[PDB]
Design a protein around this ligand. Structure first.
Ligand SMILES: C[C@@H]1O[C@H]2Oc3ccc(CC(=O)NCCCO)cc3S[C@H]2[C@H](O)[C@@H]1O
Ligand SMILES: C[C@@H]1O[C@H]2Oc3ccc(CC(=O)NCCCO)cc3S[C@H]2[C@H](O)[C@@H]1O
Ligand SMILES: C[C@@H]1O[C@H]2Oc3ccc(CC(=O)NCCCO)cc3S[C@H]2[C@H](O)[C@@H]1O
Ligand SMILES: C[C@@H]1O[C@H]2Oc3ccc(CC(=O)NCCCO)cc3S[C@H]2[C@H](O)[C@@H]1O
Ligand SMILES: C[C@@H]1O[C@H]2Oc3ccc(CC(=O)NCCCO)cc3S[C@H]2[C@H](O)[C@@H]1O
Ligand SMILES: C[C@@H]1O[C@H]2Oc3ccc(CC(=O)NCCCO)cc3S[C@H]2[C@H](O)[C@@H]1O
Lengths: 87, 87, 87
């Protein structure tokens, strides 16, 4: 089982991505309880990065299954596929 | 052997967590020598994130042993168990 | 195959490091196309962190081959070795 972690803001918000048995899922903290997020994509390995534009968070999740990495994007309104390609 | 890296400030401070044979340990840089930090917990996989409240650092380490992730918290005065749970 | 991701600035810039078959490479984004960066070092495991000095980026990549981690540094003038040692 393999994790990636990100955080942002003053609360802060935390997102932990877990790769287990070719599935990546998301646990979320926003200052109250941990909860399961919307992110569900295939992968045996994950890494993640985020930034703020004002108060709006932007997340990029790099999901790898075998020899292929797909980027998944949060920009305020659902997970969308990004334009990232490997070597 | 697997690592996680975080940094903060402009010095910078860096922490590198290393999972080796089910033990996670911490190496630290604050502007002079690398040194062994107080973090010592079980795990074969590690991720970490951090934030600053003014000058005070807050670190969260996600230590995974098998199919269980535990969150470890630095808030200025020792490593404490965090409230994180998985799915 | 294993990745590490970092980002900085408002654009933002992103760097994704991929460990594949004991080789770590780098895919870069700066606001248009994804492109291949200069990073090329050995490892089966990678972590990375970055910070700004003003708006100029400093990157540290932790490349692990078997039992030992080597730090690689970007400070604006090519990839250089760092002084990191383990336990
Ligand atoms: C930054 C984001 O924080 C959380 O925000 C939302 C927002 C809408 C939904 C609606 C839905 O899926 N129905 C879910 C989530 S959970 C979680 C996001 O995954 C992501 O981390
Ligand atoms: C920071 C970047 O955000 C996104 O930006 C674009 C822009 C144009 C197209 C076409 C696609 C994307 S997807 C995604 C980029 O890969 C990268 O994450
Ligand atoms: C952000 C932190 O930086 C470093 O700072 C300290 C501070 C005090 C101690 C003594 C102590 O509390 N011992 C506990 C028994 C140890 C460290 S090492 C390292 C921390 O692990 C952590 O990374
Ligand atoms: C940012 C957060 O810091 C910590 O906050 C609390 C707050 C209340 C309880 C009870 C526990 C924790 S532990 C830890 C949270 O999991 C999370 O890291
Ligand atoms: C932050 C960086 O972004 C990218 O920027 C450059 C800049 C220069 C070069 C050429 C070179 O090596 N000359 C520099 C010094 C030679 O003494 C390549 C890259 S690619 C990629 C870097 O790897 C790294 O991510
Ligand atoms: C943030 C840091 O950036 C770099 O900083 C320095 C500074 C001084 C030296 C030479 C020295 O005086 N002692 C190092 C010999 C210890 O055995 C080397 C480095 S490399 C790299 C650091 O590791 C770390 O990333």
């Amino acid at each position: 089982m393999q994790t990636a972690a990100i955080s942002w803001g003053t609360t802060p918000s935390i997102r932990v991505y877990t790769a287990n048995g070719n599935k990546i899922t998301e646990r979320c903290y926003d200052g109250s309880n941990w909860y399961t997020g919307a992110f569900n994509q295939a992968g045996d390995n994950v890494s993640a990065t985020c930034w703020l534009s004002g108060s709006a968070v932007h997340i990029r999740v790099y999901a790898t299954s075998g020899g292929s990495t797909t980027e998944w994007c949060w920009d305020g309104d659902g997970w969308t596929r990004g334009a990232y390609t490997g070597l």
